Paper text:
The BEN domain, which is named after the exemplar proteins BANP, E5R and NACC1 (also known as NAC1), is found in diverse animal and viral proteins and has been shown to constitute a new class of DNA-binding domain (DBD) (1–4). Over the past few years, studies have demonstrated the preferred DNA sequences for some human BEN domain proteins, which can be roughly classified into two groups based on their recognized motifs. In this study, we solved the crystal structures of DNA-bound BEN domains from both BANP and NACC1, which are representative members of each group of BEN domain proteins.
The first group of proteins includes NACC1 and NACC2, both of which recognize sequences containing a conserved CATG motif. To clarify the molecular basis of DNA recognition by NACC1, we solved the crystal structure of the BEN domain of NACC1 in complex with bound 10-bp CATG-containing DNA with a thymine overhang at the 5′ end at a resolution of 2.3 Å. In the structure, the BEN domain of NACC1 contains two β-strands at the N-terminus and five α-helices that fold into a globular structure. In this complex, one NACC1 molecule binds one double-stranded DNA molecule. Asp462 from α5 forms a hydrogen bond each with the bases of C4 and A5 from one chain of DNA. Notably, nearly half of the loop between α3 and α4 hangs over the neighbouring minor groove, with the long side chain of Arg421 from this loop inserting into the narrow minor groove and forming a pair of hydrogen bonds with the base of T10′.
Author numbering: 345 to 477
Amino acid sequence: AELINQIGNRCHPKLYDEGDPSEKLELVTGTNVYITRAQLMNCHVSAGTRHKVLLRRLLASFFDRNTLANSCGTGIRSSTNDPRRKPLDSRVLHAVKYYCQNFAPNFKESEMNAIAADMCTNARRVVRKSWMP
DNA sequence: TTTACATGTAA
DNA sequence: TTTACATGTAA
C-alpha cells in the first residue's frame, strides 16, 4: 500500500477502522490495557489536538473520582500527605502515557506526571469529606 | 459546582 | 532540582 511509508496519524491504528464501538482495543501493544473503540474515540474528539486534555480524558476513562482521590498520582515518590495513598495503576499509567507521548512527541514525562497528580488533587477537592466526628 | 491550567510549597 | 500536593483562577 501507498500508505506504509507515511508517519500516519499518531493514534490507535484500529481506531478509525469502521467496526463495533464496543470492541475492546489494546491501547498499547503488549500492555494488557484495554478500552472500547467508542470510549477512545470519545477521548480523541474531546481533546482534538490538545494532548493535555487527551491525557486527562484517558485517565478518567480508567480511574473514577474515588480511585483518583485515594491515589498519589504516578507515585514516583510516595505521598507527602497520606502514606496510605497508592500510586495509580502503574501498568495503566505507563500505557496511557506511552500512548500520549506517542500522540504528541513534545509532551514530556514531567508534564504528564504533573497532570496525573492534578487529577488526584482535583478529585480530593471535590470528594465530600465525612460528616462524622 | 466542577475542572483545565496556573501558582507556589515541602522535603 | 524534583514531585505530590493544596489552592487560586476562569469559564
